[PDB]
Design a protein around this ligand. Structure first.
Ligand code: LLH
Ligand code: LLH
Ligand code: MG
Ligand code: MG
Lengths: 395, 395
């Protein structure tokens, strides 16, 4: 009988609990490696004097192994100063992972934030948690025998991909046009050109040439890397309407919410921003402020996959498109899980860190059948490792 | 080298894709069963004449089997009219599942909504998707070899649990006091008393008696099931402050947002509501309107686990507590995944449907080590099945 005049209670023949049987983390290895860039890279931030050319990329890696035989790998990074701090903090909190059930990712995240409460819930501290958070997701996906995108649930099996590495400002227009061809012949689905240099006319010149070379249809976008003031932004915006760009990225300071909102409302061309934000909170302020048509989160930068998922849902709720920044090795899976058609950003910079390469074809990057992130650390990654530490004992 | 003066592209040694290797749904079985209630149940909705006593519960079950050998089970229900419609719609859209990768839960959900676009994105139609959505989550958890709570990521391994079945209005005060003892001796962590009958004084009498019997500390809550108007709600609210209730539930019409908000702001006692809502959208309107301190979603009612997860995140963002309604067999896992300390509602009604029983001890319900939802359909569930249909072919 379902019920009676009183109340009755069913008893559990098997009281074996999830707590007593769950897996446990027993080993963790952190690494700080540096990805050398033979060709110094300069976007508008360098041409305006805000920064020096980029010559390397810091990569902070986390490897986690569980008692029951599972392993996860993940990473965060830093372009310019930040890598030493991310690694150092990760090192100071990593031992908190030992003995935890690796499936309780959020519970662990919270424990790590408390262990470092003094240093906040945004910025560097969460970027130190990113490698760990990502490794745990990588592990859970593997535990299920699924590529990460499938563990999250995918809406597509491949995502539109555009290249950024071939459109930097240290590159002469001549070489940029050559890059467009190389990229296009390799199946790229779009081209992003860096703009925002002091000489506005020169950017217009380079942009018109690229559109000319690509033809009217090919997806083309520009990126100012925060280098314009409001006056210049709207001026350049008006003048670029003719190129039918997929979007204008970071026209203003990453924190100029009303400035972005204003440009977005004034132009038909989509506005994109967010790569520099370092937390859900920060992205939330921009989204509530209607700053852009395209939201561009960066899992490593915002604290990992866990917060990135929350940002995705917020963006979707506000009807925005998603175009994650950098780290395609991770973002491929996240954007594959986004409800609206997204874009993936391509750089070849991290290719040497892994043994496996992603398939770029017919303008899209395809999700392989490999589990989790679908990557294994290369020997080169070990060679480029400068600092490393371990906790626990390999199972 | 990470980069060069031009741009280069890595090639994929293994282009095997996630699309070509993914699992596939090959069989689906739907059932409409009826859970008989020997003792007709009456809450305030019956005493005010809005409805007739509850004598049974409709249970709509979905069973899904994949090519690679995985299976998932899930269900939704209806108290009073609704079961026939939920089953009928589920039956009319179920064949859309055949050939789909069961891991793309959201992609599938969207396909099902489109197949039934004419009937909306809330209400009965999504309640027909609930059994399916839940079965797919059950399957994914099993695929990972984890209880559902662990697949989602848990914050606790057990959750505070209170009983509701022993505090209904068709039950004489004498028997209610006996029920309190039975429940307390069986390890219940709290008691909920139904109120909201025309005779306000009688409810106060019953409530004072229960508090008296329980002692000052024991968690006690009340539920009006929408039966008070605003005037009476605040009046009863003021008078119940003395009982230090964990919450006052559904004091007003489920859609009286400002009414609830007003009561919540006027009383220190928490206000709880939401069980009757049938979608994320509906819950969103109440949360944005600050209707209650406790958000009470119902996975079956809102369209399944997928939408329920979105509701959880919204609630958390607004700093609200979670107290899911009914279906503890499913809600145990969801509330275990909630960041703030939640409450689980107990009814023994569904116990006969499954072979396994949940462990209630020391005021909390413990998550077993069983995978997915951790339940298998009983022979009794088959005996109570009135209609059934199948699609595809058992693997
Ligand atoms: O040179 C840099 O600072 C980076 O490569 C930067 O331009 C890049 O992260 C970016 O903004 N791409 O969208
Ligand atoms: O009798 C009913 O309508 C139900 O049992 C209802 O009271 C129950 O779903 C509820 O509101 N419990 O919290
Ligand atoms: Mg950029
Ligand atoms: Mg209720």
């Amino acid at each position: 009988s379902a019920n009676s005049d009183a109340v009755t209670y069913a008893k559990a023949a098997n009281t074996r609990t999830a707590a007593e049987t769950g897996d446990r983390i027993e080993w963790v290895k952190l690494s700080l490696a540096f990805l050398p860039l033979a060709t110094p890279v300069s976007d508008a931030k360098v041409l305006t004097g805000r920064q020096k050319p980029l010559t390397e990329v810091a990569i902070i890696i986390a490897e986690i192994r569980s008692r029951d035989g599972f392993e996860g790998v993940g990473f965060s990074y830093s372009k310019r100063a930040g890598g030493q701090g991310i690694y150092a903090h990760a090192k100071e909190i990593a031992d908190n992972l030992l003995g935890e059930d690796p499936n309780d990712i959020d519970k662990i995240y919270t424990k790590l934030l408390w262990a470092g409460a003094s240093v906040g819930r945004s910025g560097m501290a969460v970027q130190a948690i990113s490698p760990i958070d990502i490794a745990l997701w990588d592990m859970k996906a593997k535990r299920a025998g699924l590529p990460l995108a499938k563990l999250l649930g995918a809406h597509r099996d491949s995502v539109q991909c555009y290249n950024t590495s071939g459109g930097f400002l240290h590159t002469p227009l001549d070489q940029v046009l050559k890059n467009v061809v190389i990229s296009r012949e390799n199946g790229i689905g779009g081209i992003k050109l860096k703009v925002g240099q002091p000489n506005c006319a020169e950017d217009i010149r380079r942009l018109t040439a690229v559109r000319e070379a690509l033809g009217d249809e090919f997806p083309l976008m520009v990126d100012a890397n925060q280098q314009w003031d409001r006056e210049t932004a709207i001026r350049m915006g008006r003048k670029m309407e003719q190129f039918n760009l997929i979007w204008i990225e970071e026209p203003l300071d990453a924190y100029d919410i009303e400035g972005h909102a204003q440009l977005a409302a004034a132009l038909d061309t989509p506005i994109a921003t967010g790569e520099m934000l370092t937390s859900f909170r920060e992205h939330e302020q921009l989204i509530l402020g209607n700053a852009s048509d395209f939201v561009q989160p960066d899992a490593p930068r915002v604290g990992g996959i866990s917060p990135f998922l929350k940002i995705m849902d917020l963006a979707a709720k506000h009807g925005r498109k998603l175009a994650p920044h950098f780290a395609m090795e991770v973002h491929l899976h996240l954007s594959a899980a986004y409800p609206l058609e997204p874009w993936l950003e391509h750089f070849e910079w991290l290719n040497p860190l892994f043994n496996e390469q992603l398939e770029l074809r017919d303008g899209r990057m395809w999700i392989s059948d490999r589990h989790g992130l679908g990557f294994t650390l290369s020997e080169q990654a070990r060679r480029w490792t400068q600092l490393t530490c371990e906790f626990g004992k390999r199972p």
